[PDB]
């Protein structure tokens, strides 16, 4: 698709058997999801932006479907105010910014 | 251009006759720049990010070039960790996300 930017670019995702809404964020290095269970080992991470940092759990090799497009990569889980799809998964679905 | 997302989507901007680097950010409603001087009166605004909320100064109808493309619009100035070009100006330069 071509997604214009008049509104926030929200899409449906499927992760860990669950449907969620998430923001396509070219300004995010990483993908960050609100609290949920994921399989495998994890390690803690601190991630920052406007307002400072939050602590998250890093899970690797997680399969996600983003607007119908499957992507595997790292997902961070924690008290984010918004589910965010960051560049680590945007690249995998072939997303580009065009102007 | 077509900007891929394997690296941060950093571009050069021009504001107040000065070149700066900024991040093209589809996950940002607004454009937020690190402390600098702009002309005119400002109005207060609170914005939110990953970590919480911060206060910024809102300047309207600021002339700004983004990767060579001319825009005139609202610029927020405050303690952002990074200069970000948000959707208010991405729409002025005709940017879309495509996959
Ligand atoms: C300034 C730092 C770079 C840009 C920023 C854009 N992220 C979006 C996230 C979505 C909201 C949580 C954002 O902050 N958007 C703001 C930008 C400010 C603005 N006004 O435009 C926004 O739209 N804020 C809205 C409110 C959105 C709330 N949304 C919601 N509740 N669903 C606002 N009007 O105040 N990126 C980030 O916050 C990411 N940070 C990073 O990628 C890097 N960190 C740093 C410090 O650069 C990396 C080294 O970790 C986070 C997610 C970690 C991976």
mmCIF file of C-alpha atoms and ligand atoms in Angstrom:
data_model
loop_
_atom_site.group_PDB
_atom_site.id
_atom_site.type_symbol
_atom_site.label_atom_id
_atom_site.label_comp_id
_atom_site.label_asym_id
_atom_site.label_seq_id
_atom_site.Cartn_x
_atom_site.Cartn_y
_atom_site.Cartn_z
ATOM 1 C CA UNK A 1 0.000 0.000 0.000
ATOM 2 C CA UNK A 2 0.767 3.696 -0.067
ATOM 3 C CA UNK A 3 0.089 5.261 3.310
ATOM 4 C CA UNK A 4 -0.362 8.999 3.486
ATOM 5 C CA UNK A 5 0.510 10.910 6.651
ATOM 6 C CA UNK A 6 -2.548 13.087 7.218
ATOM 7 C CA UNK A 7 -3.321 10.838 10.231
ATOM 8 C CA UNK A 8 -1.152 8.579 12.371
ATOM 9 C CA UNK A 9 -0.082 5.510 10.328
ATOM 10 C CA UNK A 10 -1.722 2.769 12.302
ATOM 11 C CA UNK A 11 -1.969 -0.808 11.124
ATOM 12 C CA UNK A 12 -3.181 -4.113 12.500
ATOM 13 C CA UNK A 13 -0.552 -6.556 13.553
ATOM 14 C CA UNK A 14 -0.640 -10.176 14.661
ATOM 15 C CA UNK A 15 1.922 -11.125 17.325
ATOM 16 C CA UNK A 16 1.961 -14.048 19.694
ATOM 17 C CA UNK A 17 -1.471 -15.141 18.570
ATOM 18 C CA UNK A 18 -2.950 -11.741 19.316
ATOM 19 C CA UNK A 19 -4.226 -8.871 17.140
ATOM 20 C CA UNK A 20 -3.077 -5.383 18.088
ATOM 21 C CA UNK A 21 -2.951 -1.937 16.499
ATOM 22 C CA UNK A 22 0.506 -0.397 16.050
ATOM 23 C CA UNK A 23 2.143 2.772 14.759
ATOM 24 C CA UNK A 24 4.552 2.624 11.803
ATOM 25 C CA UNK A 25 7.411 4.752 13.222
ATOM 26 C CA UNK A 26 10.378 5.535 10.970
ATOM 27 C CA UNK A 27 11.816 7.396 13.954
ATOM 28 C CA UNK A 28 12.052 4.227 16.043
ATOM 29 C CA UNK A 29 15.068 1.960 15.823
ATOM 30 C CA UNK A 30 13.198 -0.884 17.538
ATOM 31 C CA UNK A 31 9.704 -2.387 17.765
ATOM 32 C CA UNK A 32 7.985 -1.867 21.139
ATOM 33 C CA UNK A 33 4.761 -3.538 22.251
ATOM 34 C CA UNK A 34 2.654 -3.169 25.391
ATOM 35 C CA UNK A 35 2.755 -5.898 27.991
ATOM 36 C CA UNK A 36 2.079 -9.368 26.609
ATOM 37 C CA UNK A 37 3.629 -12.834 26.804
ATOM 38 C CA UNK A 38 6.178 -13.986 24.248
ATOM 39 C CA UNK A 39 8.161 -17.220 23.975
ATOM 40 C CA UNK A 40 11.847 -17.668 24.628
ATOM 41 C CA UNK A 41 14.524 -16.089 26.662
ATOM 42 C CA UNK A 42 14.703 -12.349 27.195
ATOM 43 C CA UNK A 43 17.093 -9.716 28.455
ATOM 44 C CA UNK A 44 16.370 -6.270 29.791
ATOM 45 C CA UNK A 45 16.895 -3.065 27.839
ATOM 46 C CA UNK A 46 16.413 0.617 28.430
ATOM 47 C CA UNK A 47 14.984 2.605 25.530
ATOM 48 C CA UNK A 48 14.610 6.373 25.326
ATOM 49 C CA UNK A 49 12.815 9.085 23.471
ATOM 50 C CA UNK A 50 10.752 12.112 24.318
ATOM 51 C CA UNK A 51 10.173 12.080 28.037
ATOM 52 C CA UNK A 52 13.179 9.847 28.830
ATOM 53 C CA UNK A 53 13.586 6.092 29.178
ATOM 54 C CA UNK A 54 11.564 3.036 29.955
ATOM 55 C CA UNK A 55 12.683 -0.505 30.803
ATOM 56 C CA UNK A 56 11.604 -3.303 28.492
ATOM 57 C CA UNK A 57 12.147 -6.995 27.895
ATOM 58 C CA UNK A 58 13.938 -7.920 24.654
ATOM 59 C CA UNK A 59 12.745 -11.052 22.849
ATOM 60 C CA UNK A 60 14.495 -12.211 19.675
ATOM 61 C CA UNK A 61 13.306 -14.101 16.601
ATOM 62 C CA UNK A 62 9.636 -13.151 17.040
ATOM 63 C CA UNK A 63 7.343 -13.552 14.034
ATOM 64 C CA UNK A 64 4.947 -10.726 13.414
ATOM 65 C CA UNK A 65 2.424 -10.079 10.669
ATOM 66 C CA UNK A 66 2.186 -6.352 9.877
ATOM 67 C CA UNK A 67 -0.767 -5.310 7.718
ATOM 68 C CA UNK A 68 -0.622 -8.766 6.116
ATOM 69 C CA UNK A 69 3.135 -8.904 5.652
ATOM 70 C CA UNK A 70 5.152 -11.379 7.773
ATOM 71 C CA UNK A 71 8.360 -10.094 9.446
ATOM 72 C CA UNK A 72 10.738 -11.827 11.964
ATOM 73 C CA UNK A 73 12.932 -9.895 14.398
ATOM 74 C CA UNK A 74 13.429 -8.539 17.862
ATOM 75 C CA UNK A 75 10.440 -7.253 19.821
ATOM 76 C CA UNK A 76 10.673 -5.213 22.994
ATOM 77 C CA UNK A 77 7.859 -5.548 25.522
ATOM 78 C CA UNK A 78 7.074 -3.073 28.281
ATOM 79 C CA UNK A 79 5.109 -0.060 29.477
ATOM 80 C CA UNK A 80 5.049 1.812 26.218
ATOM 81 C CA UNK A 81 2.251 4.340 25.716
ATOM 82 C CA UNK A 82 1.855 3.099 22.146
ATOM 83 C CA UNK A 83 2.567 -0.090 20.196
ATOM 84 C CA UNK A 84 5.325 0.864 17.721
ATOM 85 C CA UNK A 85 6.691 -0.903 14.650
ATOM 86 C CA UNK A 86 10.231 0.340 14.247
ATOM 87 C CA UNK A 87 12.839 0.114 11.536
ATOM 88 C CA UNK A 88 14.023 -3.366 12.453
ATOM 89 C CA UNK A 89 10.721 -4.748 11.110
ATOM 90 C CA UNK A 90 9.802 -1.988 8.665
ATOM 91 C CA UNK A 91 12.834 -2.962 6.545
ATOM 92 C CA UNK A 92 11.626 -6.577 6.421
ATOM 93 C CA UNK A 93 8.267 -5.678 4.966
ATOM 94 C CA UNK A 94 9.919 -3.458 2.372
ATOM 95 C CA UNK A 95 8.764 -0.148 3.713
ATOM 96 C CA UNK A 96 10.236 3.044 2.291
ATOM 97 C CA UNK A 97 9.614 6.758 2.694
ATOM 98 C CA UNK A 98 8.975 8.455 -0.629
ATOM 99 C CA UNK A 99 8.754 12.130 -1.615
ATOM 100 C CA UNK B 1 13.747 10.293 -3.114
ATOM 101 C CA UNK B 2 13.043 6.789 -1.934
ATOM 102 C CA UNK B 3 14.486 6.361 1.551
ATOM 103 C CA UNK B 4 15.004 2.873 2.886
ATOM 104 C CA UNK B 5 15.087 2.196 6.620
ATOM 105 C CA UNK B 6 18.184 0.079 7.178
ATOM 106 C CA UNK B 7 19.723 3.241 8.663
ATOM 107 C CA UNK B 8 18.016 6.111 10.448
ATOM 108 C CA UNK B 9 16.264 8.384 7.887
ATOM 109 C CA UNK B 10 18.398 11.415 8.612
ATOM 110 C CA UNK B 11 18.242 14.442 6.334
ATOM 111 C CA UNK B 12 19.587 17.951 6.335
ATOM 112 C CA UNK B 13 17.150 20.729 7.131
ATOM 113 C CA UNK B 14 17.547 24.492 6.979
ATOM 114 C CA UNK B 15 15.927 26.721 9.602
ATOM 115 C CA UNK B 16 16.890 30.294 10.418
ATOM 116 C CA UNK B 17 19.604 30.140 7.715
ATOM 117 C CA UNK B 18 21.349 27.249 9.469
ATOM 118 C CA UNK B 19 21.757 23.649 8.413
ATOM 119 C CA UNK B 20 20.833 20.952 10.915
ATOM 120 C CA UNK B 21 20.305 17.194 10.816
ATOM 121 C CA UNK B 22 16.857 15.773 11.550
ATOM 122 C CA UNK B 23 15.044 12.449 11.528
ATOM 123 C CA UNK B 24 12.082 11.884 9.178
ATOM 124 C CA UNK B 25 9.575 10.503 11.687
ATOM 125 C CA UNK B 26 6.218 9.037 10.638
ATOM 126 C CA UNK B 27 5.569 8.249 14.300
ATOM 127 C CA UNK B 28 5.667 11.979 15.228
ATOM 128 C CA UNK B 29 2.583 14.152 14.966
ATOM 129 C CA UNK B 30 4.691 17.299 15.104
ATOM 130 C CA UNK B 31 8.163 18.637 14.317
ATOM 131 C CA UNK B 32 10.394 19.031 17.337
ATOM 132 C CA UNK B 33 13.871 20.623 17.358
ATOM 133 C CA UNK B 34 16.528 21.057 19.966
ATOM 134 C CA UNK B 35 16.974 24.451 21.633
ATOM 135 C CA UNK B 36 17.515 27.282 19.186
ATOM 136 C CA UNK B 37 16.262 30.831 18.653
ATOM 137 C CA UNK B 38 13.267 31.466 16.466
ATOM 138 C CA UNK B 39 11.446 34.716 15.786
ATOM 139 C CA UNK B 40 8.141 35.857 17.139
ATOM 140 C CA UNK B 41 5.919 34.877 19.985
ATOM 141 C CA UNK B 42 5.506 31.302 21.120
ATOM 142 C CA UNK B 43 2.675 29.375 22.772
ATOM 143 C CA UNK B 44 2.972 26.533 25.275
ATOM 144 C CA UNK B 45 2.557 22.895 24.313
ATOM 145 C CA UNK B 46 2.953 19.596 26.080
ATOM 146 C CA UNK B 47 4.065 16.614 24.006
ATOM 147 C CA UNK B 48 4.498 12.973 24.803
ATOM 148 C CA UNK B 49 6.879 10.224 23.802
ATOM 149 C CA UNK B 50 8.095 6.817 24.897
ATOM 150 C CA UNK B 51 9.232 8.072 28.284
ATOM 151 C CA UNK B 52 6.625 10.595 29.323
ATOM 152 C CA UNK B 53 5.799 14.238 28.625
ATOM 153 C CA UNK B 54 7.811 17.362 28.067
ATOM 154 C CA UNK B 55 7.054 21.087 27.652
ATOM 155 C CA UNK B 56 8.021 22.749 24.419
ATOM 156 C CA UNK B 57 7.691 26.179 22.781
ATOM 157 C CA UNK B 58 5.378 26.301 19.777
ATOM 158 C CA UNK B 59 6.296 28.621 16.889
ATOM 159 C CA UNK B 60 3.921 28.869 13.967
ATOM 160 C CA UNK B 61 4.505 29.579 10.260
ATOM 161 C CA UNK B 62 8.261 28.971 10.380
ATOM 162 C CA UNK B 63 10.053 28.707 7.047
ATOM 163 C CA UNK B 64 12.002 25.431 6.918
ATOM 164 C CA UNK B 65 13.645 23.382 4.169
ATOM 165 C CA UNK B 66 13.623 19.589 4.508
ATOM 166 C CA UNK B 67 16.000 17.704 2.219
ATOM 167 C CA UNK B 68 15.738 20.608 -0.209
ATOM 168 C CA UNK B 69 11.914 20.772 -0.080
ATOM 169 C CA UNK B 70 10.348 23.998 1.133
ATOM 170 C CA UNK B 71 7.799 23.980 3.949
ATOM 171 C CA UNK B 72 6.270 26.642 6.198
ATOM 172 C CA UNK B 73 4.678 25.461 9.408
ATOM 173 C CA UNK B 74 4.752 24.763 13.083
ATOM 174 C CA UNK B 75 8.045 24.001 14.819
ATOM 175 C CA UNK B 76 8.239 22.945 18.477
ATOM 176 C CA UNK B 77 11.453 23.732 20.354
ATOM 177 C CA UNK B 78 12.486 21.971 23.545
ATOM 178 C CA UNK B 79 14.413 19.178 25.271
ATOM 179 C CA UNK B 80 14.001 16.546 22.627
ATOM 180 C CA UNK B 81 16.749 13.935 22.397
ATOM 181 C CA UNK B 82 16.678 14.297 18.619
ATOM 182 C CA UNK B 83 15.534 16.684 15.931
ATOM 183 C CA UNK B 84 12.453 15.114 14.330
ATOM 184 C CA UNK B 85 10.390 16.061 11.305
ATOM 185 C CA UNK B 86 6.836 14.946 11.969
ATOM 186 C CA UNK B 87 3.706 14.532 9.974
ATOM 187 C CA UNK B 88 2.750 18.211 10.001
ATOM 188 C CA UNK B 89 5.722 18.877 7.689
ATOM 189 C CA UNK B 90 6.043 15.451 6.060
ATOM 190 C CA UNK B 91 2.629 16.093 4.493
ATOM 191 C CA UNK B 92 3.847 19.447 3.163
ATOM 192 C CA UNK B 93 6.734 17.776 1.299
ATOM 193 C CA UNK B 94 4.406 15.039 -0.058
ATOM 194 C CA UNK B 95 5.936 12.136 1.864
ATOM 195 C CA UNK B 96 4.299 8.741 2.022
ATOM 196 C CA UNK B 97 5.141 5.327 3.428
ATOM 197 C CA UNK B 98 5.079 2.566 0.814
ATOM 198 C CA UNK B 99 5.363 -1.228 0.969
HETATM 199 C C1 LIG C 1 12.872 11.704 19.820
HETATM 200 C C2 LIG C 1 13.457 10.324 19.634
HETATM 201 C C3 LIG C 1 13.357 9.795 18.227
HETATM 202 C C4 LIG C 1 11.935 9.731 17.717
HETATM 203 C C5 LIG C 1 10.973 8.825 18.494
HETATM 204 C C6 LIG C 1 9.608 8.760 17.815
HETATM 205 N N1 LIG C 1 8.680 7.932 18.521
HETATM 206 C C7 LIG C 1 7.256 8.314 18.617
HETATM 207 C C8 LIG C 1 6.520 7.299 19.458
HETATM 208 C C9 LIG C 1 5.023 7.357 19.518
HETATM 209 C C10 LIG C 1 4.530 7.953 20.825
HETATM 210 C C11 LIG C 1 4.968 7.197 22.055
HETATM 211 C C12 LIG C 1 7.083 9.639 19.304
HETATM 212 O O1 LIG C 1 7.718 9.931 20.334
HETATM 213 N N2 LIG C 1 6.176 10.457 18.811
HETATM 214 C C13 LIG C 1 5.876 11.743 19.434
HETATM 215 C C14 LIG C 1 6.779 12.839 18.933
HETATM 216 C C15 LIG C 1 6.463 14.218 19.460
HETATM 217 C C16 LIG C 1 5.398 14.954 18.670
HETATM 218 N N3 LIG C 1 4.656 15.833 19.311
HETATM 219 O O2 LIG C 1 5.238 14.708 17.507
HETATM 220 C C17 LIG C 1 4.387 12.016 19.233
HETATM 221 O O3 LIG C 1 3.857 11.906 18.123
HETATM 222 N N4 LIG C 1 3.758 12.516 20.276
HETATM 223 C C18 LIG C 1 2.361 12.834 20.267
HETATM 224 C C19 LIG C 1 1.585 11.928 21.206
HETATM 225 C C20 LIG C 1 1.548 10.502 20.744
HETATM 226 C C21 LIG C 1 0.968 9.597 21.799
HETATM 227 N N5 LIG C 1 0.503 8.356 21.158
HETATM 228 C C22 LIG C 1 -0.216 7.445 21.749
HETATM 229 N N6 LIG C 1 -0.492 7.611 23.048
HETATM 230 N N7 LIG C 1 -0.642 6.364 21.092
HETATM 231 C C23 LIG C 1 2.176 14.266 20.769
HETATM 232 N N8 LIG C 1 1.251 15.022 20.052
HETATM 233 O O4 LIG C 1 2.767 14.708 21.752
HETATM 234 N N9 LIG C 1 11.596 7.520 18.677
HETATM 235 C C24 LIG C 1 11.617 6.884 19.791
HETATM 236 O O5 LIG C 1 11.052 7.353 20.802
HETATM 237 C C25 LIG C 1 12.382 5.592 19.864
HETATM 238 N N10 LIG C 1 13.767 5.925 20.168
HETATM 239 C C26 LIG C 1 14.756 5.608 19.362
HETATM 240 O O6 LIG C 1 14.584 5.033 18.267
HETATM 241 C C27 LIG C 1 16.202 5.965 19.770
HETATM 242 N N11 LIG C 1 16.301 6.801 20.922
HETATM 243 C C28 LIG C 1 16.629 8.097 20.872
HETATM 244 C C29 LIG C 1 16.750 8.804 22.173
HETATM 245 O O7 LIG C 1 16.834 8.643 19.784
HETATM 246 C C30 LIG C 1 16.968 4.648 19.970
HETATM 247 C C31 LIG C 1 18.465 4.900 20.220
HETATM 248 O O8 LIG C 1 16.403 3.950 21.089
HETATM 249 C C32 LIG C 1 11.784 4.628 20.900
HETATM 250 C C33 LIG C 1 10.415 4.178 20.501
HETATM 251 C C34 LIG C 1 12.711 3.442 21.223
HETATM 252 C C35 LIG C 1 12.969 2.502 20.064
#
